Amino acid sequence: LPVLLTDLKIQYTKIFINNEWHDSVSGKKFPVFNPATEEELCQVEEGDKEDVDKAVKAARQAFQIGSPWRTMDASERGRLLYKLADLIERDRLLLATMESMNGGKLYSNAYLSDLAGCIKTLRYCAGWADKIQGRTIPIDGNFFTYTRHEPIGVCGQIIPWNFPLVMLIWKIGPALSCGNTVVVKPAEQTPLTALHVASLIKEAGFPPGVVNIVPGYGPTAGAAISSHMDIDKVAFTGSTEVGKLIKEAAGKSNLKRVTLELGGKSPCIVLADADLDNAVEFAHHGVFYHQGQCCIAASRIFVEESIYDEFVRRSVERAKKYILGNPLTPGVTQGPQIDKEQYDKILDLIESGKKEGAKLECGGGPWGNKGYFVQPTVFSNVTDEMRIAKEEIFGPVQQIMKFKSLDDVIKRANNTFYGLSAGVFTKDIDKAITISSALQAGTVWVNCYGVVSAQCPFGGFKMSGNGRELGEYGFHEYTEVKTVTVKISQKNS
Amino acid sequence: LPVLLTDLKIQYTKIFINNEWHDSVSGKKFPVFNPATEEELCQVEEGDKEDVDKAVKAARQAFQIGSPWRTMDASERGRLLYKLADLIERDRLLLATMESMNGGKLYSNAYLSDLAGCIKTLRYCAGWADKIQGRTIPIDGNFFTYTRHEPIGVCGQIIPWNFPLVMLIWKIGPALSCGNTVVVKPAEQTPLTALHVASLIKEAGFPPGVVNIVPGYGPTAGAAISSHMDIDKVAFTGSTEVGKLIKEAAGKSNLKRVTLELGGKSPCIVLADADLDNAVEFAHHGVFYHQGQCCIAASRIFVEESIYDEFVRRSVERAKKYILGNPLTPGVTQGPQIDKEQYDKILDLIESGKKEGAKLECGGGPWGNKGYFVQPTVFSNVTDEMRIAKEEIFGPVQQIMKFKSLDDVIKRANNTFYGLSAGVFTKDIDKAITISSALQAGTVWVNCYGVVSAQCPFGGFKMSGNGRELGEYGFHEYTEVKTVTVKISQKNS
Amino acid sequence: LPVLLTDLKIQYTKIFINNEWHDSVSGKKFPVFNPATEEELCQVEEGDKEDVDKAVKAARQAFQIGSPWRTMDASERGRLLYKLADLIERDRLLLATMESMNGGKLYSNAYLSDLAGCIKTLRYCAGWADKIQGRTIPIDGNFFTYTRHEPIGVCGQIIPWNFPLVMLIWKIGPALSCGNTVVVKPAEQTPLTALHVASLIKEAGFPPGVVNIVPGYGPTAGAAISSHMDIDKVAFTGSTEVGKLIKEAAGKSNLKRVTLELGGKSPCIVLADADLDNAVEFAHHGVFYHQGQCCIAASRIFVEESIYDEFVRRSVERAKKYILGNPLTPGVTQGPQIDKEQYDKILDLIESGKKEGAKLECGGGPWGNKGYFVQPTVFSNVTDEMRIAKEEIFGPVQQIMKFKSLDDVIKRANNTFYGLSAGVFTKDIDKAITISSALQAGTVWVNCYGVVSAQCPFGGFKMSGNGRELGEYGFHEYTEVKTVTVKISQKNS
Amino acid sequence: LPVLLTDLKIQYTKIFINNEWHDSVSGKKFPVFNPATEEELCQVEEGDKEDVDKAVKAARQAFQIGSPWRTMDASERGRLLYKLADLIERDRLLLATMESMNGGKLYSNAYLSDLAGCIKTLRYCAGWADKIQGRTIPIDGNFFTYTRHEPIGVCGQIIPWNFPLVMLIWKIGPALSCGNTVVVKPAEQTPLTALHVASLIKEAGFPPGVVNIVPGYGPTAGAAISSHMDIDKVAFTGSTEVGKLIKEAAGKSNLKRVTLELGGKSPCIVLADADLDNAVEFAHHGVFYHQGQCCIAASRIFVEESIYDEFVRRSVERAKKYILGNPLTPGVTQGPQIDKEQYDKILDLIESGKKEGAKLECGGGPWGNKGYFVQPTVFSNVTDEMRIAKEEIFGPVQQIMKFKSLDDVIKRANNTFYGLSAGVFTKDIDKAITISSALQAGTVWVNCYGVVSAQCPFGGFKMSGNGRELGEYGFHEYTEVKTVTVKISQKNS
Ligand SMILES: NC(=O)C1=CN([C@@H]2O[C@H](COP(=O)(O)OP(=O)(O)OC[C@H]3O[C@@H](n4cnc5c(N)ncnc54)[C@H](O)[C@@H]3O)[C@@H](O)[C@H]2O)C=CC1
Ligand SMILES: CCOC(=O)CSc1nc2c(sc3ccccc32)c(=O)n1CCCN1CCCC1
Ligand SMILES: [Cl-]
Ligand SMILES: [Cl-]
Ligand SMILES: [Cl-]
């Protein structure tokens, strides 16, 4: 685990449009904080509607028929993405450090996981660019018919603060591989890594206007994207509330394409025949990863009665082993929550668990004199009507419940408006296949949890979102299909 | 062209839920009219929110894990669809007659085209059922990963009055082939053919609740579908206004998947080297088909100056050759518009063309003492800011314009919030390919127009809709992708 | 289980070329026998080189650019195949009876399985016809590139006597769906069902020359196919010896495409945790089905030592329960072998098992005064160097062996030049996945055996064959891919 | 056009097995010559059967279940290929020089085209590695069925001398991306660039035994590959004669999979409406490229009578403009033929053209005192029965013919046992589509020629070969499909 042997210096703080750095139209700036210390790191240019309009015009122009980005070989779009991955690999120490400092994110994970994921995802996407293909189709009648899987056009992409870099790359990788242009709005909490990447987009040689990055707030810059009359598509990861607003704003304006990923209340089902240590470990990391701030957090763990008490005991032992503190310091194993709102939400929900009669096994309160820290918290004997069993907490708060009827537990697992993911732990082939088939969730892990890769599509059932990202299947959502049908004198098979 | 040698008798007038005929919960009924005579044909049970709730419950139950429709072989879903096609072929005379009588639709077209399209589309969809496949994916790490392309669940499907049968089958064919269950709301104007088909769904042996048909109005039954908390997806063909309302209602409620097809203002570009007679014929039929009531109507025809006057002359000669009257009577070549609202809209727009200075070549007024008839109408020297050049008329009203700059005409062709289709007429390979690539439209025809087939995906760019129907690509929109990732001791390629 | 309530009368005994019945050029005929009685059923026209030349010319002409079969809609090729399935369904009683009488095949299986498989396979193939698609490809440079998945042309198809109808349809279904024309040579033992199907091909309305059926012998009619200078592809199921000759003859002549399926020595691995009754049943039916005359026969069954004796006991009990006799008589559960050569081969191999020291548990000799009957025979304590462990027997002869090292048994399972299929019986997810991945076989069944369907590709690893039949993947082998690359002035994504 | 600013020094002259350099078992070496000077460049270790056996054992071991190459992530196979491309880019000057010196290949083409093609092809193949996917399949009955697209195993790959590097990469890129191991036999004429690449395979970090390179002769090392009992597949580009021998040897031994590309007699059809200068240029380069030593050489050019004389005149003017000499010297535009056999064959065929009455427009004899040089030669009024119209010349010899019947010229174009490629020159859409559809050739170029890219599949119809290389479609030929079918208690769609 190498580190930056020199203190981080913040350089890139401006709006990125047509490969140059812009002041906000208003002249306004907003502060950016270190969640572990509550101290301002810097000021960043505050994008708003006016700045979004500049970025959209730039993106529109870069998408015009005859432009460099429309006319270059697909393989060259791919080359540019591979180059960007190489640049991020070059600046890995710097990026992992900035990510950890701005995002409250453990540095070892930032370096070994987030940065690795960004690099691998970009390289995966680079490979698709010249492998996006349409069809030739044996239509009835004397016609030649083919399809073009064109890029859609200008894609507005709004990303959250929990995985700033990974989410940036998850959005831009596919969009660019397919030939789109993008207007990106990073989370107000975490604009800095996106702006560094923008410098590397310029360095790699992407044509101007192909990627534009507009830091700013949700109701301002975000809303301007969702309601813009010349944005063809909007992609978003974040809260359900905002997802609704985005879909509504898209409907009112220009009926732009919308894809959403909106978190979850993801269940695990642990059968009595399960490898118990393996289930405890994966379910543990499954809920606690990055201070509980994962859309896929395994926030309801149902365990067969006969192994329930043992499951709970071992889970508690594991949760009691964390070291809280600054995510930069080696050996520290839990960083802060991102901000006050999240902090407040986690505490309120923890209090509801105590009130509504859940058994507190450990944690249950805040930690320290600075930083938005929350003790890792475990509740057992949780019941389905409790707030901590229904609401996404997005904090280090684990719920453990028992069942003895498998039919009943699948119904309980499914009894939510969410549906992002689930986990099944068993040694039995038939149970693994039939349970995974019955769960209304986008990804089901069997005898593991939290395994996400560029090669697999990822997305929600129900209110956890719509559409899929990554894999072969995800690329479909960044193309617009055109059918071309040509009259011919006579066809032959 | 065979005919029913016995008078049509209306039998099926009720709400279809769980394969039985239901009265409306309210007890209310609404009238159904023959647009050619303005006479009531019958009364039909009026579905509203309460009836939609009954259909959704039925559809939900038919979709449950372990149900007949979830557990039957995919090939058997396909068999059921093939059987339904055979039944519609059996009742072709009856259906074509009912379609023509209720829809104001020329009987020869109803029989030879609409009914043929329904049959062929169903058979096409039947073939996909056991050919819907997921993937196995060489994910990083020691895992086995596969995907399931599951049906989504309960699909709400709202269809228009212009092609009642074709649109019914365009919706239910793919949805059912993929294993979904459906709640269908036919247009208030044209419920009758859908209800006959429902009798044939029962006869074919589809499990109850797999298809439910709820006749009724837009703001009542339609709105209940779009806002329902247990409908997983809504599909819609109709007006832009309603498309917006549907997307908004889906966002406010349960973030259900939405696909829309919303008509157009589709352009043709006729180059000087074009086969002129061929371009005139296809552009003519392209705008005039079914009294102009096609989403893809070729409602802006741009012709190179040197052949413009000849194009206009020949177009006028062709338009002056129609025989208006009852769509049932042989040799009649133009039926009525569907209803008063459409009628009023076409007349108002025709008047705006005269006012704003378009040259009237023929038609321009109503026809007859009964029926919503409009003279076939041609305007030349139309300019881009005129109402008849911007608004979808949905009537027998042709606009012809000239150009001499090809760069300019492509920009004019593209200068619309619509984008459903377009036509290009030229003998030159390079022009055909480059022009079709540059047009922002879902289907581009070359040296033809209006060629739609079950084998090709169909849908809009921009505000003409989102998603694609039919072809291989259309089937994707009726599946929900689940990734299953299984921990293994060691993988091997 | 319905039966023909009228005695079978043989009608179709001639060579089928251009949809008419032909005498052999030589005037020669050959006899056809009932294997259960050794009595001649009829005489059939003997095709030889001269007749093959007539069929190839007919097939070539039907494949010419501009012909009905090249110009008809793909959906119409599909319609024709669906019609043929409907006709075979109509004549199911007759076909199942003829199959059983000519092939020595149990009538209940013939009716319920073989005929069902033919019908289902044809319907599956019908569905692909208009779903065979090429690609459009974003090649480097200013070009438009697309591919056509054309039919190959004249396909020579040689099929065996064990599943005459199923194999006929397995060959012609895909070939025709893809638009090829075919020259079929049924086994000399079993020409009759193929000739009836030919009458139904004529009745369904296939254009003449699209299917031609040339009964005759291997070294005569078969060899003429394999060496023909105007046959584009040859497909074959049968013996390894002949497979070699076919590949060699194809290399010497016109380098025609070759696909082979050549039987096996397929292993099962039964782990100690397996559902034992389920493993015994499937392994039993897996080797004994159709008198052992299946390419996929489970002819080496390795059982973990701790359950080996119990496995063997239960296997023996099951084998001792058969009733031998005429395949037409209800309750009869084992018919004859096909002919004297097979009969002789099975007996010789059974004798080698006794000689080389295998433990005879039951059977071991012939049965009856007429018909090529062999007692169902079980050997335990078989070792890998014995003839019955290495050679495909193609008779009712089961080999059971023990193991205790899993690494070792996989190596033993794989230690063969064959590789058609295998079976794995265990309750453990990891073992099921890792073992199936390690076995060098085309199809691996888990906790079942002998499950073959039109939707899955089927074919061998190693010397069990090359290429795959059926599924999506099998269709690729009946197309020839053409790339078309068109110079354009400027491309756009 | 940069050059090596230092003289080339030959380093790598040994057999490459398990990532180390081996002497031949016999101790024998063979000489390697510069075709431009007829001087020996070096000696290279001569591989024979014994050495092939060592390489196959190494390849077999590297392919074993549990090996590094079988267990590494697919994305890592891709990474290794990307690294190799980067290494070849690093050594581009050296490789382009060695290629030109050993292969008689113009240095500017070697550098700008061959080396670029190698790099781009490797990068294309790298991108597929983790995008090779099987299927999940909705089989009839209560089963879970999926497929694995496994690597085949040990692939023997025999390549020719005309494009040593490009062909090496065309073979190993796909084979390795798919996870195979390879035993490569470069042409005896041109082993040197392959051995340098082998050093870069070692440097990139490929596991030992994954690639093995065995220089040597055809009937010795080549024959040992084709007849080997433990090689799973053989791929070959070269002469028809050898293709036959390979297919036969594969049939006699172990029925290994075979794919062949075998050159052609590729036709162009130039219509009267064609852009004439464009057709002349592409047809010219189409036959003359790399001294006529391209499988796709446009060796029959049919021109409509009305433009035939002009076509011939302009073609002659272009052919008379070459500068012969050393392929290393700037401004030199034609190098030597590869060796004496080719040289002799070209001269003999040129003499047959004079004898049989073809009109000699220019060239017709040898050139210089050393090097296998042949004057660029044009024949007009060539007729279909002449040797130069039927036999692949593989020299700088152009045939031009006239036609006036389009039906007739397509039949003439098709009247060959070859079918690798063809060209069509016209401005008319319908002709371009219908002619290209009618030509029995693997690639058809329209208004261009010789446009080959990694993204498109490439291969012959008829005796020009079997199978396809590159594109998505080519990758299929380097996988072996396994179906896995698992019994489950109950399936759900
Ligand atoms: N799916 C996921 O991974 C995430 C889920 N969440 C959930 O949402 C809850 C609230 O967290 P927030 O930070 O408020 O998430 P949020 O959904 O409001 O913020 C995420 C992104 O949306 C933008 N945004 C906010 N308001 C917007 C608007 N009106 N229009 C357009 N864009 C807008 C933000 O600026 C940011 O870029 C969390 O407690 C958690 O449960 C939060 C972040 C990520
Ligand atoms: C290859 C893409 O990059 C990464 O995987 C970075 S890490 C990571 N990304 C995402 C999630 S949700 C999600 C949704 C979309 C895209 C990426 C992710 C997550 O939860 N994580 C931590 C897993 C730690 N795990 C602990 C045990 C196994 C992995
Ligand atoms: Cl498509
Ligand atoms: Cl998928
Ligand atoms: Cl292809």
Short mmCIF file of N, CA and C in Angstrom, two decimals, chain B residues 250-286:
data_model
loop_
_atom_site.label_atom_id
_atom_site.label_comp_id
_atom_site.label_asym_id
_atom_site.label_seq_id
_atom_site.Cartn_x
_atom_site.Cartn_y
_atom_site.Cartn_z
N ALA B 250 -45.81 8.26 -13.66
CA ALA B 250 -44.93 7.14 -13.35
C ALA B 250 -43.84 7.56 -12.37
N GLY B 251 -43.31 8.77 -12.55
CA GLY B 251 -42.31 9.31 -11.63
C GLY B 251 -42.86 9.58 -10.23
N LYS B 252 -44.07 10.12 -10.14
CA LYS B 252 -44.70 10.42 -8.85
C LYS B 252 -45.09 9.19 -8.05
N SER B 253 -45.44 8.10 -8.74
CA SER B 253 -45.98 6.92 -8.08
C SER B 253 -44.89 5.93 -7.68
N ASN B 254 -44.54 5.02 -8.58
CA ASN B 254 -43.65 3.88 -8.24
C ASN B 254 -42.48 3.71 -9.21
N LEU B 255 -42.16 4.78 -9.94
CA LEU B 255 -41.01 4.80 -10.85
C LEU B 255 -41.02 3.64 -11.84
N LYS B 256 -42.22 3.23 -12.22
CA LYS B 256 -42.42 2.19 -13.21
C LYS B 256 -41.68 2.52 -14.52
N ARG B 257 -41.29 1.47 -15.22
CA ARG B 257 -40.63 1.63 -16.50
C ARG B 257 -41.63 2.22 -17.49
N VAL B 258 -41.16 3.11 -18.36
CA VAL B 258 -42.07 3.76 -19.29
C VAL B 258 -41.50 3.67 -20.69
N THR B 259 -42.34 3.28 -21.65
CA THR B 259 -41.98 3.43 -23.05
C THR B 259 -43.13 4.09 -23.79
N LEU B 260 -42.75 5.00 -24.68
CA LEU B 260 -43.70 5.84 -25.39
C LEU B 260 -43.41 5.87 -26.88
N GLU B 261 -44.48 5.85 -27.68
CA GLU B 261 -44.41 6.27 -29.06
C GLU B 261 -45.48 7.34 -29.32
N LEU B 262 -45.06 8.48 -29.88
CA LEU B 262 -45.82 9.72 -29.74
C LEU B 262 -46.00 10.49 -31.04
N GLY B 263 -45.95 9.79 -32.16
CA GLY B 263 -46.14 10.45 -33.44
C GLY B 263 -44.98 11.34 -33.88
N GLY B 264 -45.23 12.15 -34.88
CA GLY B 264 -44.14 12.83 -35.53
C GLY B 264 -44.52 13.96 -36.46
N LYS B 265 -43.49 14.49 -37.09
CA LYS B 265 -43.64 15.40 -38.20
C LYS B 265 -42.58 14.99 -39.20
N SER B 266 -42.78 13.79 -39.74
CA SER B 266 -41.70 13.11 -40.47
C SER B 266 -41.44 13.71 -41.86
N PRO B 267 -40.18 14.01 -42.15
CA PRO B 267 -39.75 14.58 -43.42
C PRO B 267 -39.28 13.58 -44.46
N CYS B 268 -39.54 13.90 -45.72
CA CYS B 268 -38.88 13.27 -46.85
C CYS B 268 -37.99 14.28 -47.57
N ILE B 269 -36.87 13.81 -48.06
CA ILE B 269 -35.93 14.60 -48.86
C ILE B 269 -35.84 13.94 -50.22
N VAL B 270 -36.30 14.66 -51.25
CA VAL B 270 -36.30 14.12 -52.59
C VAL B 270 -35.22 14.84 -53.41
N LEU B 271 -34.15 14.12 -53.74
CA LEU B 271 -33.07 14.69 -54.56
C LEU B 271 -33.44 14.72 -56.04
N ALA B 272 -32.75 15.58 -56.79
CA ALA B 272 -33.04 15.74 -58.22
C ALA B 272 -32.81 14.46 -59.04
N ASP B 273 -31.94 13.58 -58.57
CA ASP B 273 -31.64 12.35 -59.30
C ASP B 273 -32.63 11.21 -58.99
N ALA B 274 -33.60 11.47 -58.11
CA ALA B 274 -34.55 10.45 -57.66
C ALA B 274 -35.40 9.91 -58.79
N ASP B 275 -35.81 8.64 -58.69
CA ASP B 275 -36.89 8.17 -59.54
C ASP B 275 -38.12 8.95 -59.10
N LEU B 276 -38.58 9.87 -59.94
CA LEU B 276 -39.60 10.85 -59.55
C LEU B 276 -40.98 10.25 -59.30
N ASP B 277 -41.43 9.40 -60.21
CA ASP B 277 -42.71 8.72 -60.05
C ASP B 277 -42.74 7.90 -58.76
N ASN B 278 -41.67 7.17 -58.51
CA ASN B 278 -41.54 6.37 -57.30
C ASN B 278 -41.57 7.23 -56.04
N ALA B 279 -40.82 8.33 -56.02
CA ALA B 279 -40.85 9.27 -54.89
C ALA B 279 -42.25 9.89 -54.69
N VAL B 280 -42.91 10.29 -55.78
CA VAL B 280 -44.25 10.88 -55.65
C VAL B 280 -45.25 9.88 -55.05
N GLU B 281 -45.18 8.64 -55.51
CA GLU B 281 -46.13 7.62 -55.08
C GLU B 281 -45.97 7.30 -53.60
N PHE B 282 -44.74 7.09 -53.18
CA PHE B 282 -44.45 6.71 -51.79
C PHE B 282 -44.67 7.86 -50.82
N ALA B 283 -44.26 9.06 -51.22
CA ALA B 283 -44.55 10.24 -50.43
C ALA B 283 -46.06 10.51 -50.33
N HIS B 284 -46.78 10.31 -51.43
CA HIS B 284 -48.23 10.40 -51.42
C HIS B 284 -48.85 9.42 -50.43
N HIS B 285 -48.61 8.13 -50.63
CA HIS B 285 -49.18 7.15 -49.72
C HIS B 285 -48.64 7.38 -48.30
N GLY B 286 -47.39 7.82 -48.22
CA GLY B 286 -46.76 8.15 -46.96
C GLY B 286 -47.47 9.17 -46.09
#
